[PDB]
Design a protein around this ligand. Structure first.
Ligand SMILES: CC(C)CN(C[C@@H](O)[C@H](Cc1ccccc1)NC(=O)O[C@H]1CO[C@H]2OCC[C@H]21)S(=O)(=O)c1ccc([C@@H](O)CO)cc1
Lengths: 99, 99
């Protein structure tokens, strides 16, 4: 799809078998989701944003479907204000910026 | 042009008579610029992201040139670690997400 930016680019994602809403975020290197139960092993990490740093649970090699496009990569889980899909997964679904 | 997301979507901008590097950021409602001494009136604002909130100064009807594309609108100035071009200006240069 071609997504204009007059509205927040929110899309439906599927992760851990559960549907969620997430923001396509070209300014995010990484994908950061709100607290949730995800199966598998994880390692604690720190990520920095506009307001400082937060502790997150890093899940590697996680299957995630974004608006009908499959991706498999790293998902950070922690107290983010919004579910953000970062470039690590945007590249996998072939997402580009165009003007 | 078309910008892939392998690396940060950094572009050159012109604002306040200065050239700067900034992110084309679909995850930002508004444009947020690193501290700079712009003339004119402003209004205090608080914006929140990963890590919490920062205090910024809101300037209205600021002219910004993004990759040769002219735009004019709201710019938030504060202690952000990066310059981000938000949707309020991305729409004005005809920027879309595509996959
Ligand atoms: C979290 C989003 C919902 C919101 N943010 C936009 C994001 O793109 C942000 C940009 C960014 C990139 C590098 C350093 C600091 C900030 N990226 C980010 O935090 O990424 C994290 C995860 O991956 C890593 O890579 C970079 C950092 C790590 S925000 O800047 O905080 C923000 C909040 C409110 C407004 C108002 O206009 C209302 O929207 C406008 C902008």
């Amino acid at each position: 799809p071609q997504i204009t930016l007059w509205k927040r680019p929110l899309v439906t994602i599927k992760i851990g078998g559960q549907l969620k809403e997430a923001l396509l975020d070209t300014g995010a290197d990484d994908t950061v989701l709100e607290e949730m139960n995800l199966p598998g092993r994880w390692k604690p990490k720190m990520i920095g944003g506009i307001g400082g740093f937060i502790k997150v649970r890093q899940y590697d090699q996680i299957l995630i479907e974004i608006c009908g496009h499959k991706a498999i990569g790293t998902v950070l889980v922690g107290p983010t204000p919004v579910n953000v899909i970062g470039r690590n997964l945007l590249t996998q679904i072939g997402c580009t910026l165009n003007f």
